[model samples]
Target: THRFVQKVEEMVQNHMTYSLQDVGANWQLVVEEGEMKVYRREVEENGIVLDPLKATHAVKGVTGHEVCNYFWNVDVRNDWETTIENFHVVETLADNAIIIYQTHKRVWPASQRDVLYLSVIRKIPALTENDPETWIVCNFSVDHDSAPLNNRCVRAKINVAMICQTLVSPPEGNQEISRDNILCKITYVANVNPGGWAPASVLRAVAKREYPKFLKRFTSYVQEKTAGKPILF
Candidate 1:
């Protein structure tokens, strides 16, 4: 009973830290009535990549193996004929708190445009020898036709493994990391010719972060996803 009462007190203090107070039966309605001009933000249009090369360039300030131990990643989003330059980047302060620099623009019409580019940078805190590095994503972009003649949004099917490899692992690990770590790959091939004012559909993937985890938890998690299949970790 003492512990439960203490927990309740702590909960009240927690709410009070945010300037909330306990009032009477009308407290719930009072809380709801304090409606000022709350700026409801529009759902942000996702940052898109137009050129992988440009994406890589954005992170040039923080590359090389010295700054990282765990490595970072770069890849295409869903359905868009993407260039390295088209990916938009944003930084978040919550988890790893990395900066993202990105831009998206359609490419000028030209023959033979099959290539995509990307650059990823990481800064693992060398605070301790065994401490895993923090993942920092510096650049992400997609490229498409940028011209007055073509109003098409750049859309194309991209191979996920191809880009992820370039950004995440050392070139040599190309063979070491198994393909299964790559959970799902989405391809976005452009459907329209001189594609009109159609909004581009970007593909995204959710997969396990190949970082440290509790052994039992990790095993159970992967097993559930891959049907009890076992492979390299």
Candidate 2:
């Protein structure tokens, strides 16, 4: 467990170095709706060509704190995670991490699938007054309590990493800190391997259709929920 936690920390450190400017030719821009941009690249993982996805988007009028809160709050997960048919928290680890079991609603031609993973959320404080604050939420698949309980659905393995960087400019001369001057740069990376064999074309098509919709819907949900309300940060 100690080694695993260290590996997760190292992974998060490496992911923080990724920037929009680092997007290479291989990273195909698959979806663009409003300010949200989704990118994907096919890679051979464990002899399977899976599409690992990336998204870069900025949401105005919100802080990183607020965005992370919504993402980490299990109570409101179903409100934004439209793909989930059922979600259960199986265990809570030390260092504020928890294991979750999720069953996704089946799309046509595909059976319903479930995944069991450990999720860790962390807040990285700003180093200096001018620096931006950041938050990271990572989910890594693990075989433990819920892995053997997949009686009704196929068990899938997934790795997901998300970082929310809060950008805040110095208050306009004598003005107070508020949402008007905040922006959250959201970077998401995910790769899921369905436990059983599925056609490559089918997986690619589902990814193309689902990723953009998920991001757009979640952004709209946050904006609407916080509209005209006090900034949580």
Candidate 3:
């Protein structure tokens, strides 16, 4: 555990503690499907697209640990993440943290995009006895010498946090718990800087559709993968 591990705990806490409901005034609802809702703000920096997006979703028959475990595991990422064309681990920072580099499918007109990030998975204990435990997978952009700045692909910057909390309902006393009684609450926040000269309108349009598709596909993929498996937490 070096610097990568050092920052994982703090980043995980930030994702878990952020108030997603305090949308202020400028948060625009981009996508909504059942209990899944996505919000974004039109933001840019010096001709670069920097759209901050947030989404809240809940899925039944899953636990926080189960959802996050599937997300952090690279072996299963390609099965759900359709945009990723190539992905590999650059370094193993820790048992639960790793440095990864992945390139996404081109969105037409824009040059191919690639990203290097540290993916971390962690668990946070509930403060009160009544509260449920939390699990998170935090992925943030990072620079590494192994994967130097390339000329072929636009290196997009990303800060994505997947926070999951599981709630279980049962009898007041000790009772049997089933997948039907479990629900995983998810809060996903992402801030991506398209490090190229992509048009603002195009960037927004792409994310408005792509982000929701990623969430829905990912959650359902998790549900399918974990349907007959044992509970993680």
lDDT of each: 0.25, 0.78, 0.85
Q: After superposition, how far is residue 52 of candidate 1 from its true place, in Å?
A: 21
Worst 10 residues of 2 by lDDT: 13-22
lDDT tens digits by residue: candidate 2, 113-189 = 89988887888777588767778787878778345476778888887877788777777799776777878889888
The candidate scoring highest on TM-score is: 3
TM-score of each: 0.19, 0.87, 0.93
Model 3 misplaced regions, further than 4 Å: 19-24, 171-175
Could you tell me the lDDT of residue 176 within candidate 1?
50
Our model 3 lands, by Cα RMSD against the true structure, at 1.8
Runs with alpha carbons beyond 4 Å of true place in candidate 1: 1-118, 126-132, 141-151, 154-233
Better model by lDDT: candidate 1 vs candidate 2:
2
lDDT of 3 at 227: 91
Give the best candidate by lDDT: 3
